[model samples]
Target: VVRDVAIIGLSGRYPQAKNVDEFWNRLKEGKNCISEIPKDRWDWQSFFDEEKGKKESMYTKWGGFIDDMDKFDPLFFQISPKEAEEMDPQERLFLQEAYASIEDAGYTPTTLCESRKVGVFVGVMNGNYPTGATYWSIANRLSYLLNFQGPSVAVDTACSASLTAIHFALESLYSGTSECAIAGGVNLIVDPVHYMKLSALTMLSPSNQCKSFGDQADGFVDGEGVGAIVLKPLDKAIADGDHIYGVIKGSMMNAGGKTNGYTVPNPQAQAQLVADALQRANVHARTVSYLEAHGTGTELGDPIEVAGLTRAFEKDTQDKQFCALGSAKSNIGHCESAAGIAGVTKILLQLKHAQLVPSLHSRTLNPNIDFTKTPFVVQQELAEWRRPIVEINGTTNEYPRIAGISSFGAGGSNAHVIIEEYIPEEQKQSSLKITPQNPAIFVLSAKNAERLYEIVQQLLAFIQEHSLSDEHLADMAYTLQVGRVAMEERIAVIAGTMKELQQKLTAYVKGQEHIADLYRGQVNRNQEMLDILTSDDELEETIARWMERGKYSKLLDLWVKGLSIDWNKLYQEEQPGRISLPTYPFAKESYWTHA
Candidate 1:
């Protein structure tokens, strides 16, 4: 069984940070990334002066901007310096974060080159080119570099773009067209003309403060960021020994119908979409643990979303503990197309760290927003993880069952995903032997070695600081060792034992093997490596026994083979083919006769 879609790896850049940790630290500390606009692009002095008032406000006084624009190294990513210089920072951010995401997953483009079954689904808005280039120029370079023949479509559904991208990626996997996908969203507000145009509309936040679901809520602070996640079929992930983040159990998207105000949200449509997702996931609203909402701090949007949520959850919304709602934009501001991914990243961090980050600046909720007196708790303080309420046959139970994440676009497009946390029979133990003598140092020699080293260093620091106990250290080491081997062949040699090394060295001396094979690939290169190192034998045996008890005995292994589907045969020639007008007429007449 394919099981569900798993978010195996994630990477992001937002406001003041280039990675998730930096972003998390800033978020936990309640530090505001918003700052005065620099003078090179706009005159900040005029907007700040009360004497000038709204007349001289061509540029918004404040924004969350990325500071170092010139620090990105395109050559390191195998991109030509000229092309990199001219490429849209939006696309550049996508490339950088996408690679980082893949690396985090313990996988790489080079490793999957032969697999060719990998696809990319990106969400993007504001396709305005960088200062010196055009869309064609960026497209040409992207096409040449990525070489993804499969669905690499770029969505432009405003705030919903990224979530829609994730939806499309899930569809691709469910349709059996792709085994793995690089799915995410990116947006860069680098165009001065567009920025001024948005400012004219009064959409930009006046105080650069996002008071989501608060009394002082105004508008959104225009922010820039790129976020990405590597999604793999659940069975494939489990078999490949990949770290599971959270499972995307079900998702749905719907468009808002005609309304009086173009910008006003349609609560009915929102509720309907969430209902559809819940039904598909076969879970009740009461089971939902948390909500990563599109609370842009806009008065209309926030209230409408709350109303929609109230309708969807019904009685469940009355229980505050059942649903802890918050907005990532409260911390990093809205990153437009990148907003959903940022929200997802925040949720993942919460899941991993087992701690909830508060939604800053929110003290009270709007009176117009009602939760139908159900349990809807706004998390005001950071708390340790609590087991989610389970939804069994649309009924709330004791264990965690489903969670819903929503993203709504400006142009009426909407997407919602229902995620279920997976609990392995028991967690696996670390396989690597990390003594004080060999404190687990990761070394890489690629063009992007510096960045790779930095990532490794971060992981190492995280392990050392957090896993002070022997049991925790063992788990960390096992995960890191397995991740490194699965990701790149270059790491194989480092994880090998002394016996294997002697054999390899002897083989190399006799000219029976190429030095490149040992040097260019992973460290622990054999099946025996896992068997020898794992400490949780009992748990592994239990899982193995369960697999053998099933009809699909080798289910996990089968998934890794990457089964292909005959789409034409399944959709066109199958029983559910589209009916012609005459067929439809006959069916209608038959229905009338039956009635």
Candidate 2:
């Protein structure tokens, strides 16, 4: 059996994208996200200097900047407005995005409230950013809100932090210490000192544009972002019938100690890093079709990365230009700590879409990179991405599409991972197989009626856009029923088909009047829920029986009343996992504050 981890869910917010889907579309269109520093961030002229040699003078006025850093909704996560205002934007964004990732994986918060050994690992580099949240809080803060019980850690290897975070998360899952994991990184340009220091070394792109692997490569652009992905053991993901974007075959990390300089990238160490990861994955380097490179768009970094790839791929066969290389940094600039996760997310999109996106601004190739001798080509335009093989495990059409992601920290911590296309034998869905004895229940809940209406709108828009099969419809109902919290204002729909479900939902939104099978009510258990303190096994058993007997009010009311439900036990033999759907509709009123 292959040892691997499945990427089940992903979400992020970048300068060009509010979510990962937008990010993917932007990349495929070859749209660049570079921009001048926002007025809110700083006075560009006051800090900007024409000459780089000057002290305290930032060379570039441009970077990858994200808006609404101060905007957040405390009510969304059950946090107070005051606390939200005091919280770091990175912490808030990390919490929401990580929650979004969990939602994307189709796991409801209540469902995972008592989940088995779920882990949370986040990479953070902007420790200098003044905030109430420490570097550890980036991970710990999310963990507390998520209420998941497992190892929660924060990796701080500068640029390689997020990739290193992924390594730790994967290690946890592999070691059986974690049944699943939330892994990612978050970075922001809140501290002016960060910019000044980086610019001192002439690291900021003079043109404020990233020309990764281009002939005019000079320096990397500063960037800010937050992203996370949901990962599960490959076998567990498959068994749970989870939708997989890709599989992490193997990953490894090493520190290049005492190199030529403390901050210099070691190509030999990086090359060895890639080789070791591939060997552990037992994959031949010649077969990899694409490589999501750690191209920082720097004069030295680009060539060193290429050289590393060439050396690593030369181990098995000396293939020529067989792999396509690209970098997200070329499009979104270097996201610092979030850079590595950005690359991983990019490769996942490429693998899913089967199209290699352009590594923008590579009009003239970097002469220093000997692409002619290497089995790699700097992907300049959108191209078809497919599996390249005939004899993988000695069988034709059996080899999965494989690729590698590389990330090198300035302080010598380097990381590499082999990601492969996860095309599993489709399983027969239990929803279609099991006859609907009664109209299935579709439940919706939110903090208030307005938010509930928005939830209704999101759900209504979804079914109208994409029709679901009987099996999928049942899965949707199951996910909502077992995974979500039964909020105060609840709307439950009992329908036999997708069309009927939508009709009921639409009717309910039109008015609270009774549709064919819609039940709208309020849960009167706020004070009652808080008062409960006993663990009654008998009550749990009763609820379990009620659920199995198709009497749901007992379970729903009890859940809303703050009952500890074993969501896994709720679904007997048909072990259905979460599937990506429309996430929470945040009713955000800006919770911004002056530093």
Candidate 3:
């Protein structure tokens, strides 16, 4: 059963692109937005002084820096130029993207103000240091401006900050605390203090290139972006006639326990989080078709992610279509707090287009990755969307089911989400009069001139074969124009008549199934059945029982009640096998030389 959280609107600002359309165009064209660092910073030349003969200064010359900071019109935000300049770039970026997101949803912030049921959840890795070392800068501004009394959360779980925001937002909806939410993340590395600190940590790549999942990968190329998504209860979105892009079924988050090294990832924690997320979503590992990874391109990080993914999928890792993997960092560099949201936006775009964006510079797989041992495959070629594939054991099959997405934070916090595609209920068969008056067809595509023409031709052929009338096609075309944006690779199509639309969709789905069969062969139906062992009712009942127990302590007690172990013996602190140590003792130290 799919839950009701829907992503109705999305907005973003990245290195080379100020809007989602620009971002998509750059992506599809394989444009590298990275460039030389501007001169505004505190003596960048000193870090890269050729005369000094400091060949490995540790500061990379290239980065995806945003320009034209002076050009931002403060009037649009109803703020003075001085005030805007004084504010942190993260706050400004949040405001801009927030407005864009609401506008994209066909609603204004003022309109949302009419209802008290709306909430705000923003993710910020580092608060305002851009305005100097004042801690009250951003928090004060956000609380004052947004004035959202309903659960205004500020998350700082490192790279997965935005994803944590999304997870909390979903929880808000599920708990019936908010009907709708503005969820996203913002990061601005334009500040000198923050940049210097990051540089000191050696987190940034020496070469200033983000070659994610690639052979020559050294480290992440630091960048900045703001990505926001408007989420509403799934049923409310559908009922309110809002365009639904995708459904967020379930999400989970957990911290990494004590580990050997501070930065070393805990694979056990990562795998556990994934498993818990899947269990909460009531989805089988085999049913996850695509996995968007947090491939930051670090020597240690990428391998850890691979290990976590392997543990999460377990046995199913060997079978599926090698799960189409992608890293937004490959194109835009690591956006820090905004990374996960950017990745989510990329995945949403891919889902809509049915085409997989290639992971640039990934010419060869890491030899350390035992491909023969693991079932995962890194997608090298551009993949077209066939039928929606479902995982059944280790193979692909036609099933309207779930997909998994994982986001790991630098702070050892991780989140996994299971998003299931929408499948409408079966209805009574009905026939409509096929005439010139009630023609049925639709055409839609991104704003690209060439792509639009190609889409139009494709739609025309589809309509002609089905004998759809001109008027019906016109209606479909109108729907597309009013509801969607003209981003380069992002496009969608809707039907003029609901009934005929369903029929066309069914036919299209059938075609996809045929393609999947050709490429991956048929899925194991038996395995799929075994995977979805519990019915929706049974799962719901189990969750209800668990929740009724109130605390995790009680739940654990219930789980261990009938175990064979003796509780009394286990509780004995100073027993034979348990060595006891002395309490605190004062030490009087004297230096002595050992022979």
| Best candidate, TM-score | 2
TM-score of each: 0.74, 0.88, 0.68
lDDT of 1 by residue, 1-595 (tens): 2247898888888889867888888878777888767664546564443321244345466777765543456644465666555556666667667766766775546454355667677787776553543333322344357565555667778789889888888888888788778888777755465566666666767787888887777788878788789888888677755667788888889899887778668999998998888877777676677888888898888878887888787733434446788887877788888888888888877877777778877777766666446456777778876877454556775765345689998879899988777786663333334454333222222223333344434444554445434333333333333232232222222222333333443453354545432443333344454445344565355444543454122322221122111212211211211100000000000000010
Per-model root-mean-square deviation over C-alphas: 15.1, 3.7, 22.7
Local accuracy of candidate 2 as per-residue lDDT tens digits, 377-425: 8888888877686554556663667888888888888988889998767
Candidate 2: stretches off by over 4 Å: 113-116, 391-398, 429-438, 464-471, 508-514, 525-577, 592-595
User: Sort by lDDT, best first: what order?
Assistant: 2, 1, 3
Pairs clashing within candidate 3: 4-234, 286-391, 318-375, 319-394, 320-394, 439-469, 439-472
Top candidate on lDDT is: 2
Whole-model Cα lDDT of every candidate shown, in order: 0.63, 0.78, 0.61
lDDT of 3 by residue, 1-595 (tens): 3366888788887889866666777777666787777776445766653232233343666777664433343554457766766666566667666766765674545444455566677777775353453323333454356554556667778878888989988888788787778888877655454555666667777765587767666788878788789888877666555556678877899988788878678888988888888877776776565777888788887777778778778833446344566677878888778888887887777666567667776777766666555546666667774545554555776864345667777778888777766654463132332243433223232333344445445444545554555334433433333333323233232333545654544454343543210111112223444245333465445534543443323322222221111122221232111101111111112211111
C-alpha lDDT of residue 20 in model 2: 74
